[PDB]
Symmetry: D2
Subunit: 425 residues, 4 copies
């Protein structure tokens, strides 16, 4: 029973050892839940991770007059044809900018949508101009007023169009894919995001009766249909959660077997772990990592859109490099100043120099436990890893960020022999 004021207390010094199951991808669940707005019979979304971003998306639907049902198996059924209010309120959107994913499907299905324009997120520069322009390319009339994106479809509905992304955008690609699914005619999205969650969304849409081809490549072709039905869909495994537990095991010089995952959606990460000296073996749906008694070797990292190394794994590799042998350069090209975790790890004795988009990490044998503060729902997992490799106790506050991004992180780490406990708020 997580609470906003929860903390984690970690005692470092244990080599991890054990097996856990990987949960469904948070960032596939979010767009697929938004996609349920397109369906005229109920959609059941399965393999959901139990983390707070799902709760927020469910709350958002509630504010629109749609009451999702969580069954005994913890799957979510959404029947969007009870929708009352075509508005995604600022009160909710300000807490989770991924809420913007309802813009595309709401507009395509219902002919109009008012969605709060996301403001600042501490991660970095994250405008949504390409979401707006892409929809305008489908005939949408859009204005910004009162802090809302106010969108209206042409008479007869959205029309298929060509749209070229000047910058690769994950949720931008997802938003336009969903809108295109019910548009009149052919849509071609160029320089599309290739992220596995984009493919998962396309596969869900096709299960609902859409015609989405090319997901996973630079070019997505959508032939719009008049209506979509509801299906039952299991979201793919979470590659960021997968990578995070592999790094935790590597950093502690231990080992882990991950089940219900997929090695083919984090090749960049697996290769970097092999560079760090990890012994890795894989199967269709499992990964085993074993350091076999060695400290990790420092590695260089460069973030970029999939299939390159993910910005959502960058912080975790800093915490591993922090206790590795040698010097590693960690470079961001996606979110150039996403390094808040560095300055917390500095409190724990890490040796890290930051210049612009580059973090230069000099590994030390062990960090030093200290209280630190989470701020980033994916990157702050690095603070948990840092705690695992620190002398003494590390007390992490503002865990609510981490609880947005990971299912019960301390319960899974306890199964791997970590000394970690949640301190109730």
């Amino acid at each position: 029973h997580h609470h906003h004021m929860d903390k984690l207390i970690i005692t470092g010094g244990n080599r991890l050892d054990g097996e856990i199951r990987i949960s469904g991808a948070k960032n596939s669940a979010l767009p697929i839940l938004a996609a349920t707005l397109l369906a005229d019979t109920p959609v059941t979304v399965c393999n959901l991770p139990h983390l707070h971003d799902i709760t927020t998306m469910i709350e958002l639907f509630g504010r629109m007059g749609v009451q999702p049902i969580i069954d005994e198996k913890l799957n979510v059924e959404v029947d969007a044809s009870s929708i009352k209010t075509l508005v995604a309120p600022y009160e909710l959107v300000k807490t989770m900018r991924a809420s913007i994913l309802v813009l595309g499907p709401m507009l395509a299905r219902f002919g109009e949508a008012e969605v709060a324009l996301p403001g600042g997120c501490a991660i970095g520069s994250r405008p949504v101009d390409l979401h707006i322009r892409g929809l305008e390319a489908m005939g949408a009339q859009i204005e910004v007023e009162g802090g809302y994106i106010k969108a209206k479809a042409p008479a007869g509905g959205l029309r298929g169009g060509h749209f070229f992304f000047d910058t690769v955008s994950v949720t931008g690609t997802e938003n336009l894919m969903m809108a295109a699914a019910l548009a009149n005619g052919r849509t071609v999205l160029q320089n599309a995001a290739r992220e596995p969650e984009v493919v998962d969304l396309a596969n869900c849409l096709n299960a609902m009766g859409a015609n989405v081809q090319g997901a996973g490549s630079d070019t997505i072709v959508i032939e719009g249909v008049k209506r979509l039905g509801g299906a039952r869909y299991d979201v793919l495994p979470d590659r960021i959660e997968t990578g995070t537990y592999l790094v935790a095991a590597a950093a502690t010089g231990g080992r882990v077997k991950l089940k219900d995952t997929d090695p083919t959606i984090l090749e960049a990460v697996l290769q970097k772990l092999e560079e760090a000296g990890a012994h890795i073996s894989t199967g269709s749906n499992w990964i085993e990592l074993d350091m076999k008694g060695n400290r990790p070797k420092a590695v260089n990292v460069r973030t970029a859109p999939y299939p390159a190394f993910p910005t959502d794994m960058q912080a975790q590799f800093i915490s591993m490099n922090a206790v590795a042998e040698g010097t590693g350069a960690v470079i961001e090209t996606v979110f150039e100043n996403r390094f808040m975790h560095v300055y917390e790890m500095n409190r724990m004795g890490a040796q890290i120099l930051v210049e612009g988009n580059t973090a230069i990490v000099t590994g030390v044998p062990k960090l030093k436990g200290a209280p630190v503060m989470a701020t980033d729902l994916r990157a702050s997992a690095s603070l948990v890893i840092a705690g695992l490799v620190a002398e003494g106790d590390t007390l992490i506050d503002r865990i609510y960020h981490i609880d947005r991004g990971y299912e019960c992180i301390e319960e899974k780490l306890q199964l791997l022999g970590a000394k970690i406990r949640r301190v109730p708020g």
Copy 2:
């Protein structure tokens, strides 16, 4: 009585007109309050601004067993003789990293100090390695443990030394100046910060009986003295507050007379305002700005250490450029990621492209009111200015940031004819 949950509601569209008084500099008050820890007889600090960072510094002193006396005029007398605990606790330091300013004076006066190592601040990369290295150059033995800087002076006290600043540091320069003031022998600080608050601290130290020469230049020479006495010091005017009200008047196409200020501590800002079309007249302690019925012209800005254009004025010039005639490039060289205000102004219909350290602003005639969120105790004043030039109402939340950095901002703006109200939390 300010409350953590206060909001500001603004209605835009009024040309400002009136006169107000500028308060003492927040960032002179903070190091001068730290400097009072050096004295063996009480020091009284005057012309203090009534804002929350001073309250936090007073609370920090209390935690160490020093209870400042606040008189009827809100002057603060500090008697450090009662000090009980040579520790600046994480619980407080984590709320205000400027707390690190007590490290130098406590070490030099009392021979030891434990001060929590600041973690992350959302503004950007802000390590304090130069504070530590500088103190080590004076013979201090320093380790980081449990998240604390644990410092001990040699037997006989700190010794004079040479320290070269690889990067210009405002509080770094201040910390070492204070440590040097009671050290044994001569300290030379090279590539020193030239900020007017550094000069003000030196002038206060000298009033207290120190021997600090060269403040304001690249090189500060300190001859340590035996004891520092009991001065009554009026801190200099706040140049950021000054610039902020000047920009507010300019952005609204109105005018303002500022009293109890000093034009010579913001020449960069005055020149940029003239470039924007402002008519400016000055006297020894006042500034008058009048737009004479013109819209501001877009200007380019480049932040750098004093006397260059201040990073603490950068956001405010974005909000002016956002309603100016033409396109203006706003470039950070101090905090390359300090642009969170941009994304709030985008909710208000601003036209701003951000690429790394560069914000390209295309002016529009008027912004559009929307709810927005403060995050930065100096830069979020730009959201107040944006509200003043927006159509309709702008509701700003998390005002507690702004109340750290500005004395009663809505009360001063009311005197200039702004339609602005504090909504009590």
Copy 3:
């Protein structure tokens, strides 16, 4: 007959109008010429552009004891069976770093290679660490000595391997593809370059008997074969030459029909030209652009690997933006300091601000003729375009750069009505 000291003299002010034929891709010709070193029977390469990089590659082969034959139709036949010396000399490599393309095929075919390590190129940072690590992944043992990359295959020849490109690399992908073609076993290249020249190379290798699949996607799978035979291969059209003449037309407000090209290999460029106001029609192998005498509209541009907007078209869009209506931001993510053309255009009265990887262009109605200096075999084409839109005469020297990258540029522009002349050195 070109000479190292040739100049171009341009008189601006004429709307271009006419049609020309597009030549084969220089950057397909170079890797395909390299690939002929793999074959045990002669390979004939057709549709070659007549420009200096081809001449340099042929000279390189000569230095290794391979003498290509240029027939009457200007096709090049290469019979690598006479090869004598497995060395790419520094004397030639220092003039053309793309010479490194012989490293992969020489190593795979002959079991060893010495190729001079390229030093500095004024474009910016261009290390070849991925070429080296990629070949090591196929069993190469590589040393750097005397300024040479000295590479040796393992017993029995190169072996199939897996390699993940941390950064997308065009010639790195090509080098590894060629080496994989004769390796023992399966090679998988991940995060591969998708440039059309990479596809063209794969298609030529397959025509020679190889088994290269997936070129054009991020994952290339190669099944090595023991030997490769001859082929007669026509290289695809040059998308950069195509883009350049389209911009030349657009910038002068003219029109042009380009024959023997392919719109599908420059979709990003075509879309940006439409944004600038151009009317574009296309056929299977032609593109026609008509400005209808209108001044172009300023556009924003962001370079990235194919299919995104190419760095090799960036400078050309600066020269169009230089005379456009409005302000356009031109952003590099590939070669972040490739802006030397800007400072030449400034001599012609362009209004351009550069900060880091961003050029901010404010368009003026016309430039002003002045003597300027080429430095970049592709980007300096922008100086020719600038001259076409300048008042009076523009004299460009160091044309030898441009002659590397474009087939007789003045002769093609003359066909479009340009007033341009080559001044013989």
Copy 4:
């Protein structure tokens, strides 16, 4: 006798040991030679270094109709009374952009000037907007036409003005200082460059009858005078030549005593050398460095305007770090892409990673001799130093760059026991 096609051949492996005399500063000589245009009686400039930039400035004066006389003591006397043509031609300016230094004095003394606008320099972005805007602040009306800055003073000549430098500019400060010296009234330059050469220029102007105060500080005040007379002026020692030979000695683990220099104009460099393990002693006009045969320790460096670490010493510290013990980060904030020397050193087996403005150097015990190419009149001295610490021979081409920036470099190194020879072109 120097020739354009000269090369240097270096044999590495010797610890340097000896003493040489330091020459006058090139970058004081250049603006002081320009300043002679202000005087109505001959000025004699003394302690000049014998290097090619001086020769170019003398040739420039020649093209204007002024014939400097080089006397028996190799001092230069300039009598600007004979001047005939107020034009600095592109033919000369294109070879040395520092030629722009004649703009300010020509305009101030003669009421008009035409000076070619410098184009590209491979170092990176070097616009001269602040020179132009600064002179406009003194009443100049300026056009760019035919690639010339064409400048005209108002009726009665230049007028005292205020100018704030948005970015610190060395030659910008010098140009405005010279122009102000003959202007009618008071000029204030704010955020002025503090470089020692700026002080040296001011002292020479004052010797000539000017009234320049505050040079060396952020603020320079000039009271214009109607005429300036002659002077005999000895330029100060060259701090960059000084730094370079100290690094050459340190990199080889040797010793050197430098005479006729001044430790107080390179404190940042001396401190970094001590960090690298050098034992340094100084006197009023000499510096002695002794490594005692020890390998240097890696250091971090960050360039910035004087008195910070100079960009003109950056490359030399990369060459020392290249053979040092450890990892050193070398960061540019002045010329953020000035790293061409890195890629030549990579040919010699250096281990350097460049990302943006940061070079990460991993030291190795020795480099490996290879042919390399100079491109930068100050930074390419790093290639000479790299050759001194490389196994075998290093052949450096395009030595003419180095001959611009250093007086007879191989002759001075020979006095220290280097094995180095000039190969005549």
